Amino acid sequence: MYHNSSQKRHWTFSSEEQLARLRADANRKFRCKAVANGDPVFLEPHEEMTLCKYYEKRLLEFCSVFKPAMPRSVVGTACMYFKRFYLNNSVMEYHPRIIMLTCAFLACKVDEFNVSSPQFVGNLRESPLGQEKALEQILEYELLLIQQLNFHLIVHNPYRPFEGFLIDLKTRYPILENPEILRKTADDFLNRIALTDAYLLYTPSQIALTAILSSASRAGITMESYLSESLMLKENRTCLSQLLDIMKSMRNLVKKYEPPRSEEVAVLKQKLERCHSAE
Amino acid sequence: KRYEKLDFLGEGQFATVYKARIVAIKKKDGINRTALREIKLLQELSHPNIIGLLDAFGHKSNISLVFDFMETDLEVIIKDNSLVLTPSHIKAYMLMTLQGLEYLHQHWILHRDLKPNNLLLDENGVLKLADFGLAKSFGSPNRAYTHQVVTRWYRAPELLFGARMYGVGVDMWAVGCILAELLLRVPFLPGDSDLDQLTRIFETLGTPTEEQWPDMCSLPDYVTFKSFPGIPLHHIFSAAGDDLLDLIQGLFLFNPCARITATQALKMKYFSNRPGPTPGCQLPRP
Amino acid sequence: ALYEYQPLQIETYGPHVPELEMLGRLGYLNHVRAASPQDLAGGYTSSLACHRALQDAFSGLFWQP
Numbered sequence: 001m002y003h004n005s006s007q008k009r010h011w012t013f014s015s016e017e018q019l020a021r022l023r024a025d026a027n028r029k030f031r032c033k034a035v036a037n038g039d040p041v042f043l044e045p046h047e048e049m050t051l052c053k054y055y056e057k058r059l060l061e062f063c064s065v066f067k068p069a070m071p072r073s074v075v076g077t078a079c080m081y082f083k084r085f086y087l088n089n090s091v092m093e094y095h096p097r098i099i100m101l102t103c104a105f106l107a108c109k110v111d112e113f114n115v116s117s118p119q120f121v122g123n124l125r126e127s128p129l130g131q132e133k134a135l136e137q138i139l140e141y142e143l144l145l146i147q148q149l150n151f152h153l154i155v156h157n158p159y160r161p162f163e164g165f166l167i168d169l170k171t172r173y174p175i176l177e178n179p180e181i182l183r184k185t186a187d188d189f190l191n192r193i194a195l196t197d198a199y200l201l202y203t204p205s206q207i208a209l210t211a212i213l214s215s216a217s218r219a220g221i222t223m224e225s226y227l228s229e230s231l232m233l234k235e236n237r238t239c240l241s242q243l244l245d246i247m248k249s250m251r252n253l254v255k256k257y258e259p260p261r262s263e264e265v266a267v268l269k270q271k272l273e274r275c276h277s278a279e
Numbered sequence: 280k281r282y283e284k285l286d287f288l289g290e291g292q293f294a295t296v297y298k299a300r301i302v303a304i305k306k307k308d309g310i311n312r313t314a315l316r317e318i319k320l321l322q323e324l325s326h327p328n329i330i331g332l333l334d335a336f337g338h339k340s341n342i343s344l345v346f347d348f349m350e351t352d353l354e355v356i357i358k359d360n361s362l363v364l365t366p367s368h369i370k371a372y373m374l375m376t377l378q379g380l381e382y383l384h385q386h387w388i389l390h391r392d393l394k395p396n397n398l399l400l401d402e403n404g405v406l407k408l409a410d411f412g413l414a415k416s417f418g419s420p421n422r423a424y425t426h427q428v429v430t431r432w433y434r435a436p437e438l439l440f441g442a443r444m445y446g447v448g449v450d451m452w453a454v455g456c457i458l459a460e461l462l463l464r465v466p467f468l469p470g471d472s473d474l475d476q477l478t479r480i481f482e483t484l485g486t487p488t489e490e491q492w493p494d495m496c497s498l499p500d501y502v503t504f505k506s507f508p509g510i511p512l513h514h515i516f517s518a519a520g521d522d523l524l525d526l527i528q529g530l531f532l533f534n535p536c537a538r539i540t541a542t543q544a545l546k547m548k549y550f551s552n553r554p555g556p557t558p559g560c561q562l563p564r565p
Numbered sequence: 566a567l568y569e570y571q572p573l574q575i576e577t578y579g580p581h582v583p584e585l586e587m588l589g590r591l592g593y594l595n596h597v598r599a600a601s602p603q604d605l606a607g608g609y610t611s612s613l614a615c616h617r618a619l620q621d622a623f624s625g626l627f628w629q630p
């Protein structure tokens with residue numbers, strides 16, 4: 001359950017500033033380590049963020065063509081693993097190409113989605129020697145990934161809260177006659193919310209409710225009575241306001257997110273390759 | 280490492296346990312899925328009657344788990360002929376087991392391996408459920424389960440009939456078996472095979488009908504048995520009180536839905552009637 | 566000391582979830598998939614899935630880091 005989970009306790013952060021601080025500390029720690037052990041080779045935190053967004057997209061694409069059919073909960077767990085890993089680790093030390101595959105592997109194990117290692121690596125569009133090399137790399141990085149997650153493997157995704165909210169709307173909110181029409185767009189918004197840092201800043205229930213209400217507002221429905229009356233928030237004004245600003249900030253995070261650009265990503269990919277070759 | 284090994288506690292088909300400084304460390308596929316299951320579940324649970332995962336470490340694809348050191352388990356208590364299991368002791372063990380199981384079921388997790396040696400006892404007399412290597416989350420309709428779970432002696436008839444979907448009853452039935460083992464000091468239904476396990480169940484508690492199990496015939500591995508009358512419960516457990524008999528009957532109901540849940544079992548008069556459960560410090564120890 | 570059942574309470578930081586047995590009365594089960602006879606025989610009901618979904622929906626809706 002989320003309300004006493006590790007995700008709530010250790011992986012839900014106050015603001016974007018704390019996340020940027022974690023990423024900057026990771027970047028600076030790698031810079032210090034490389035300077036001591038061993039400058040246009042190094043990457044700044046915003047460049048690391050662009051690379052991380054690119055490879056989160058790569059992980060999503062990998063999971064969306066995985067055979068056998070890969071549960072969406074598994075994909076959410078893997079993407080959460082990726083985000084959490086690169087909160088405290090530099091893409092310059094551990095390559096995101098391997099880390100994302102390790103995240104998918106660990107998520108498949110943790111979610112109880114049973115798949116054999118050769119079956120897993122067969123989904124990679126690489127030659128058999130490449131698949132064996134990738135499997136060896138994943139095996140090397142699995143324990144490292146688990147350690148960097150502080151052994152917090154259960155990830156609470158917003159999809160089940162989304163389903164529960166749909167059940168509640170269909171039962172206790174006759175004003176909205178067919179909550180099913182809210183699904184697609186809400187799911188779409190959910191996808192966009194996944195691309196931001198919202199999974200580290202808000203609860204899965206808050207994210208699901210924000211997606212549903214964004215779908216309702218986009219459809220032209222002001223279903224605020226669900227919050228006021230059905231959710232009891234009429235008696236508590238403080239709770240109502242403290243939820244409304246949460247959804248508003250979530251919408252603003254989705255508004256201010258920018259997808260990585262193509263040739264910019266190419267430049268940073270060359271930079272990362274140089275970082276991992278010179279080392 | 281940070282833990283200095285103290286003693287070798289045991290070796291199993293899945294892992295080996297060492298006492299160390301006090302804690303207990305359990306040492307191309309990758310990291311073992313049993314250890315990963317234990318970590319992922321015990322990190323999300325905190326309750327006095329559930330084994331605590333204090334730490335975890337490892338190297339390469341081997342991983343060691345750190346738990347609190349438990350002095351004994353219920354199997355050693357049951358098999359020890361020099362300890363008398365009074366009604367108060369049995370009630371205390373049952374109470375701790377059911378409280379841990381209620382907490383576990385509230386967080387939508389099935390133990391699926393309940394048995395006397397998986398119910399460990401600390402030095403203070405606190406019973407903790409352990410060996411979560413078969414434990415799984417339940418309540419999701421899109422996820423199928425294996426019927427091989429639970430050691431055969433404590434496996435529920437729905438599991439023995441091939442149920443791929445089940446709830447807390449699979450634990451509850453095992454709890455009932457444990458309760459029976461606490462009263463008779465011997466395994467209640469020691470079947471040599473699945474067929475023999477079902478035979479012993481029906482020979483002791485009668486052959487269920489549709490009146491007691493409205494959809495038993497839908498189970499994939501259901502085979503029509505002989506219509507046994509069973510044995511009355513007061514004949515099996517002569518020293519059992521009426522409240523204890525009601526608890527046993529609820530735990531051993533053939534219908535899993537009708538089978539009492541941990542919450543319902545805790546609310547039964549048996550736990551509220553006299554005598555009260557023994558405090559942990561006064562429970563028997565080998 | 567005689568045992569007394571104290572229902573353990575865990576703060577969910579969200580709206581109240583209707584109890585497991587009341588779900589059918591309140592009309593929730595009309596919006597979840599009906600359990601097949603096989604699932605019922607093993608002790609699986611649609612009520613469990615509905616209760617879990619509602620609990621997940623309401624868990625930590627009002628919580629702030």
Ligand SMILES: CC(C)c1cnn2c(NCc3ccccc3)cc(N[C@H]3CCNC3)nc12
Nearest residue numbers: 288289296303305346348349350351352409
């Ligand atoms: C949580 C787990 C890793 C744990 C914690 N304590 N503990 C102990 N302690 C000593 C003891 C306890 C009970 C009976 C005898 C001896 C033994 C043991 N494995 C033995 C016992 C059955 N097979 C090998 N596993 C554990």
